[PDB]
Every structure is written in structure tokens, then in C-alpha cells.
Amino acid sequence: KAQQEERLDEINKQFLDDPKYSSDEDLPSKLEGFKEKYMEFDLNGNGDIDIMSLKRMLEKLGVPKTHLELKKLIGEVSSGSGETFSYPDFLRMMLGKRSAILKMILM
Ligand code: NI
């Protein structure tokens, strides 16, 4: 938990130096806030967010979603084999010009 944060920090540093996101003057503090938002979710053994974790989080936001709807949400932001999405997946979505449904829900 607090351990997995170490990895999130390394990723934030990686993104901080990414020219693709340099135009955002508030990147330094935003990445930290996004990290905190990500850590509100239950993170699995690999530090990724799964279906039940997403379900739990959306419940807290008053946004109930069906099992299949949860699959659609993750499948939209996941860079791997649909089922879970990572922190890097999360940042590219939160940043990035395209607006995934999960991004609109969370922001
Ligand atoms: Ni889980």
C-alpha cells in the first residue's frame, strides 16, 4: 500500500520528464494529486486496478455500474489484456486529449 506508492512515485518522475505533458504548467502538483486519487482505489498485487476495485470506487461516487459496464470502462483505458488498468494507463487517460468515460467520471 504505502509500499506501492514508491513505484507510483517513480512513474510520476517518468511522466514529469515526458515532453508530451510539458505544456501543463501544473504537472508537478497534478501528478501528485492524481497519485492520491489512484491510491483511493484498492490496488492489486501488481499495483493495478481491477473490476471489483473499480466497482467499489464508483459506488462511493454514487455511480453504480453493471459488471459489463465496468468491463467497458476498463477496456477503454487499459493498455494490456482487458481486466485491469495500471497507473501509467491511468495517467495517460487523466492527461491526454481524448476523454474516456472513466476520466469524465473521476474529474
Ligand atoms: Ni482485487
Curated annotation (Swiss-Prot):
Summary of the function given for this chain in its UniProt record: Actin-binding protein that enhances membrane ruffling and RAC activation. Enhances the actin-bundling activity of LCP1. Binds calcium. Plays a role in RAC signaling and in phagocytosis. May play a role in macrophage activation and function. Promotes the proliferation of vascular smooth muscle cells and of T-lymphocytes. Enhances lymphocyte migration. Plays a role in vascular inflammation.
A GO cellular component entry from the record: ruffle membrane
Keyword terms of this UniProt record: Acetylation, Actin-binding, Calcium, Cell membrane, Cell projection, Cytoplasm, Cytoskeleton, Membrane, Metal-binding, Phosphoprotein, Repeat
Record PTM Phosphoserine, positions in chain: S23
Domain of life of the native organism: Eukaryota
Subcellular location: Cytoplasm, Cytoskeleton; Cell projection, Ruffle membrane; Cell projection, Phagocytic cup
Gene: AIF1
Entry binding sites for Ca(2+) 1: D42, N44, N46, D48
Annotated residues for binding of Ca(2+) 2: T84, D89
Record text on subunit structure and interactions: Homodimer (Potential). Monomer. Interacts with LCP1.
Statement: the UniProt record of this protein carries the keyword Nuclease: no
Major localization class: cytoplasm
Domain (EF-hand) ranges: 29-64, 65-99
Topological category with respect to the lipid bilayer: Peripheral membrane protein
Post-translational events: Phosphorylated on serine residues.
GO MF term list: actin filament binding; calcium ion binding
Any GO BP: positive regulation of cell population proliferation
Tissue: Detected in T-lymphocytes and peripheral blood mononuclear cells.
Name of the protein described by the UniProt record: Allograft inflammatory factor 1
